[PDB]
Design a protein around this ligand. Structure first.
Ligand SMILES: [K+]
Ligand SMILES: [K+]
Ligand SMILES: [K+]
Ligand SMILES: [K+]
Ligand code: NA
Ligand code: NA
Ligand code: NA
Ligand code: NA
Ligand code: NA
Lengths: 779, 781
């Protein structure tokens, strides 16, 4: 990662093909004529970032592609510094990568997630001394990059992992010029006492190549705190009463380094923050001396339609959405993530646990270990400036065997100790962590076991017991990963009849209906319990967003881990507002059931209604009749005391809530049908055009019994087809962008691109027991 | 390839996945529980032979897959011999292959077209001496095979070739047991003079391992002609005498048999070998003589390619196809650009087809040492593995080696040098046969027999220029043989003759770029060539390219995408009407074919007399139109076209019945077609109409029709048309055929696709690929 503020993202005018080529010459050779043998195979025009698996990760019928691919482009290289260096900078590419200038290989890399670079200065110059350069390419420089994500047992992470080992140039590639002498590494170590009285900055600058260079520090308010003019170094300064960075107040200082030479100015701007943190033995966690409850989530480098190839603008939206939920903490999946995410965590205010991808499978040979050592090193060195980061993780579920014939707790223990020592040698400032490896729990500073209350183990009401069992089983405890799957749009009516009700069950993984109705209770319970555990460090629920995993072909959305509170395209589930009503300080108000169109029960039966709100008082209205203004109280489960039991008319009902917080008044409204007719087994599929959009039409399939009652119970897979194989929005991994998807209360919908109309859309049950239904979509 | 009559084809219970795996352990590791991480990726249950590109070779929207894939299965290994040896035998696998017993690699191979084996004897043993054999697999043996057809410019053939470099175990794999001492090689050289007075049989036998052994030679009738017993020595040689032997020829493929037999521990190792007595000669500046008589070689080619299977042809499929060729009247075949399945060689021996077989040094230039060693190795394997076949008279050393591009250099002198090394290697290995190459003028003097490139009427000049170009080619080389000629035709596309810059609209230059790819054109081109060959006494012969439409990666935009359409039959073996042009000239079996069985709508002015051609080898043929006899006519090859069997006839608007009767002595032969005659002319295409014309118990045929704005069929429309379906598996697609293609150019305003009956009801859509017409739909009951 070159330190400079001037960089060009290479996003346009790339070609890509998803296979290996016969040689670099085959990649580079000229085309002698149309239809000649070298004009196949065909390449694709693509824009970067690009991912091999943008679609096939969630395609229900194929294994996501794991193999080589090539990219190529023509670059206009104009290094404006005399004797300047020219680099291609990779913010991230998976999994193995080779870089060529014309026919000469420049650099190679193993590792999907660290940053690295390729100095092309010499190859470029050499290419310019040949006639081919201007006679054939007209000045430009031919560049080719091979990316490979073939299965490799000796490379981390393990394919046993519960996520995709994406291939491609899925993080930005930058063209970077520097002058002859330039910055190579700017390390900023800010320290402060737990009370914030004394601050100490400490800047180490490593130059490349080998007149004065300046160094300025700025306060969060832009005030030049101090300047240094020096000469070609390390450096340390005291500060009294430094403004402290916290999730609540993510205040950031700035360090500016300038090299001036030949009248041009190499500048690099960087941010850092002062904060103190402590993981109390057998106790909670303190940030700048005050106990803080870590309210944590996870994210993967994954998104609908793009696989790993997210843009900056997408990352901003998502991180902003996570901040508005009220999180103050996040574990960045199982690998180093985009520098854009880290900078967002510094800017918005989220503490960070970032780990290397030693994730399941056991332990490999020497290059395996060297990748781990290298990636830990790269992660620490590339990210250490970020105030947000407080944990360096060393591995995840390393107790999970299977990638080798042997599994050796002693060898794993030894290597884990080596990594712990390397992290502390490299960055004393922070603590180490692993998750779920009982026989290494002592090696690290902060341990997380596996605790999935009500999902994989026990009932969610056993959380507090299991949590304290964990706090007592380890020196320093953090709870990484809890929650459970919900099929967005599936709901379930409470049935107060061998358990407190139908939601009070053990291990909903294999006993639950994967409805939002259940998980909303489970999240709710956990967050209530957390209000009365003053010695808990905190926890991180897995996970923020539905994401693709190769391990779940048969999930309600195939190949999608559905443990988000938000769909894979960012569309919030109703559980999102559960977290938001407990954790956010911005007043909000959400009636549960915006995505619940039809409720059921016997005629005149009073129906439960839950509101999730951080307002202290909310009044609810049913069909215009106030049902009473109630007061928020987290202990009155569920919904923190904001629940009613109201009668519903057969057919439509209008449900309304008004929220009060001081002078502020909030409002929300849903409409729901109430169905008193009971239903038999599904008998027909009804296709409806629900209409939707200036560019999209929403098609709904409906499972009904022989007398025409919707089967609000039905979970059958439904499959969509179409006379135009590009009209359906498919392979998104979402509720309305999947071609095969389990019904949600006997219902399944899919979007149709309007510009492709007119077409015919078909809907079938996957088991092919019902008759296929057809609908004409005109536009 | 081990000589024993006792071997087992492993066709059942294989698993396959089209990607590399993370290690051989990952292939072999056990399943710990349903849904556990090692449950993915998912594998396919397949039956061998199997090909990576069974469908995607001709899928119009993808590059055919070029990469690794894995097979795995469980074998009961019951070797019935004391210290016997167990081998997996590969009759062919592409392109690179690696063989594993459990986690141990056995053998590896580079080359997709020669035979090779892997001796698994010691690994099976060392594996049985482990507890996992009994505990986990219950005494059976786990086998895995990695095949790879990644692009590799240092591997022959070149990806510039006009065929797919297919991947997978597309030829049979055999489990084979032999004794500790066994036959390794059995070479049989039958020699006879050009009039068949005497015969000599030299027999060389090599043994692996290291008492006596037996050797019997049986006539083509089963009668023992000669017998020997001899002491077992590592290499042996025997020469047997024989008076006026039965001669092998295409017309009369008399085959002798040699049976070798070895006994130990009571068990009898036997191997049976066929061979043939024949004498042949390529005359300098002259023709070709078989058993003392000049014989005009009537040749074709075939690729190891077929609809729905890529290279994974079964033995039954090969029987059907070779018979179809023999019945066409060919006597000669060049087996594509590579060694082909031994089943094809046996069929050539048995039906009577002379053979040119070459190594896949095919385009691109010349690579490094590994590349050169592969060519030396495959030439060696091809000759050693097929030399006992009497059908084989020509070893080819390469094809279009003047085509550069796979490397930055192209060194004619280095190519000459390596070509000359290969010629010497072949003549050293097998002095009894001639070397050939095709299209490399700067090497043409090196080999025994040479073919230039000559495509009169297709890639150059007019088809009427054929004799002149053929004579030029015969004058320009010591021994000449015309390999490759003909041209593409879109099955079911035709064109009315028009006499208004040439003789008629079919008298054109270089139809590849200038023609309409109709059957009408190519039929005349084949007709002309064939009638010219009757007046060329110096011509050894030719091989037209090619028998059957086959997939090629080089033609994304062909009327059938990715299909080379120069066959006289479709990729599924459905005959085009050009198949009968050849048959009428070459077959001795009486036949009669009115041209136009696949031509449903003729056109022209009202009452205008319309031409009808008939392709028959019957001496006399009478045509009837609508019951009215049009005259008995005598067959005369030189009376072009249709050898004089042609009539001009009135057709009425509407349906017309056209019948023909041919007379061969007392054989009355009959044929009949019906055709509509359309006198209305047409504007540009404007609507697509769908209809169904299903006549099978399994399939419905759906037809798209391009019509003008007044409802008139556009009878010269060639637009690409695309099919879709509410059920993505109902359409019979990716076949490379006229009715099994998702996208295909219209054939006189018409395109059709088969629909699977079981999947009905569905809705089929048809569009012009350019999207200027509105999409059509039809519901299929
Ligand atoms: K998938
Ligand atoms: K791996
Ligand atoms: K293809
Ligand atoms: K090749
Ligand atoms: Na490795
Ligand atoms: Na392994
Ligand atoms: Na995601
Ligand atoms: Na090359
Ligand atoms: Na074929």
């Amino acid at each position: 990662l070159i330190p400079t503020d001037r960089k060009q993202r290479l996003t346009e005018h790339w070609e890509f093909i998803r296979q290996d080529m016969g040689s670099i010459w085959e990649v580079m050779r000229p085309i002698t004529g149309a239809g000649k043998p070298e004009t196949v195979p065909l390449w694709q025009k693509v824009t970067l970032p690009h991912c091999f698996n943008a679609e096939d990760a969630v395609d229900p019928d194929v294994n996501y592609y794991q193999g080589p691919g090539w990219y190529r482009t023509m670059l206009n290289i104009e290094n404006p510094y005399t004797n300047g260096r020219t680099c291609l900078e990779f913010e991230g590419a998976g999994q193995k990568t080779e870089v060529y200038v014309y026919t000469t290989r420049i650099a190679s890399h193993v590792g999907g997630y660290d940053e690295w670079k390729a100095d092309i200065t010499e190859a470029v110059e050499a290419f310019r001394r040949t006639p081919l350069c201007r006679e054939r390419f007209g000045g430009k420089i031919p560049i080719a990059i091979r990316c490979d994500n073939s299965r490799d047992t000796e490379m981390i992470p393990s394919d046993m992992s519960d996520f995709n080992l994406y291939g491609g140039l899925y993080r930005y590639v930058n063209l970077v010029y520097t002058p002859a002498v330039h910055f190579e590494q700017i390390r900023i170590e800010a320290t402060t006492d737990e009370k914030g009285k004394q601050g100490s900055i400490s800047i180490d600058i490593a130059f490349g190549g080998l007149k004065e260079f300046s160094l300025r520090v700025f306060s969060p308010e832009g005030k030049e705190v101090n300047s240094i003019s020096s000469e070609l170094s390390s450096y340390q300064i005291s500060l009294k009463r430094p403004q402290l960075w916290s999730p609540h107040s993510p205040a950031l200082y700035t360090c500016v380094a300038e090299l001036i030479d030949n009248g041009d100015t190499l500048r690099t701007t960087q941010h850092f923050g002062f904060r103190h943190f402590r993981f109390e033995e057998k106790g909670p966690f303190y940030l700048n001396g005050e106990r803080l409850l870590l309210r944590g989530t996870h994210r993967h480098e994954d998104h609908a339609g793009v696989g790993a190839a997210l843009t900056e603008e997408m990352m901003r939206t998502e991180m902003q959405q996570i901040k508005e939920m009220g999180a103050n903490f996040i574990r960045l999946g199982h690998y180093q993530q985009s520098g854009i995410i880290l900078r967002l965590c510094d800017e918005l205010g989220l503490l960070v646990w970032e780990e290397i991808p030693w994730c399941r499978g056991g332990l490999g040979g020497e290059s395996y270990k060297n990748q781990a050592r290298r990636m830990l090193t790269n992660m620490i060195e590339q990210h250490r400036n970020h105030p947000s980061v407080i944990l360096w993780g060393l591995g995840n579920e390393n107790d999970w065997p299977g990638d080798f014939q042997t599994f050796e707790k002693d060898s794993i223990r030894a290597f884990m100790g080596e990594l712990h020592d390397l992290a502390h040698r490299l960055d004393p400032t922070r603590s180490t962590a692993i998750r779920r490896c009982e026989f290494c729990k002592d090696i690290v500073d902060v341990y997380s076991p596996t605790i999935w209350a009500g999902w994989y183990g026990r009932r969610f009401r056993n959380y507090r017991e299991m949590e304290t069992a964990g706090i007592n089983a380890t020196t320093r405890f953090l709870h990484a990963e809890w929650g459970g799957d919900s099929h967005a749009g599936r709901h379930m009516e409470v049935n107060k009849e061998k358990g407190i009700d139908n939601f009070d069950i053990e291990a909903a993984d294999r006993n639950g209906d994967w409805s939002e109705s259940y998980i909303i209770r489970l999240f709710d319970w956990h967050l209530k319990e957390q209000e009365t555990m003053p010695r808990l460090t905190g926890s991180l629920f897995w996970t923020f967003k539905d994401f693709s995993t190769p391990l779940r072909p048969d999930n309600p959305i195939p190949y999608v881990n559905q443990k988000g509170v938000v769909q894979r395209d960012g569309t919030p589930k109703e559980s999102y507002y559960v977290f938001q009503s407990y954790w956010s300080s911005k007043p909000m108000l959400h009636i549960y059931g915006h995505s619940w169109p039809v409720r059921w029960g016997k005629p005149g039966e009073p129906k439960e209604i839950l509101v999730y709100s951080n307002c202290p008082e909310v009044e609810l209205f049913v069909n215009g009749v106030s049902q009473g203004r109630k007061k928020r109280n987290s202990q009155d489960f569920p919904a923190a005391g904001l629940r009613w039991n109201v009668p519903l008319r057969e057919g439509n009902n209008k449900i309304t809530a008004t929220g009060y917080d001081g002078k502020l008044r909030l409002d929300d409204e849903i409409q729901q049908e109430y169905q008193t007719r009971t239903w038999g087994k599904p008998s027909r599929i009804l296709l409806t055009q629900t209409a939707q959009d200036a560019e999209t039409i929403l098609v709904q399939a409906e499972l009904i019994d022989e007398n025409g009652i919707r089967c609000l119970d039905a979970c059958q897979f439904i499959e969509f087809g179409c006379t135009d194989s590009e009209a359906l929005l498919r392979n998104q991994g979402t509720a309305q962008g999947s071609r095969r998807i389990q019904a949600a209360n006997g219902r399944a919908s899919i979007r149709v691109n309007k510009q492709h109309a007119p077409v015919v859309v078909s809907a079938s049950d996957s088991k092919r027991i019902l008759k296929t239904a057809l609908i004409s979509v005109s536009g």
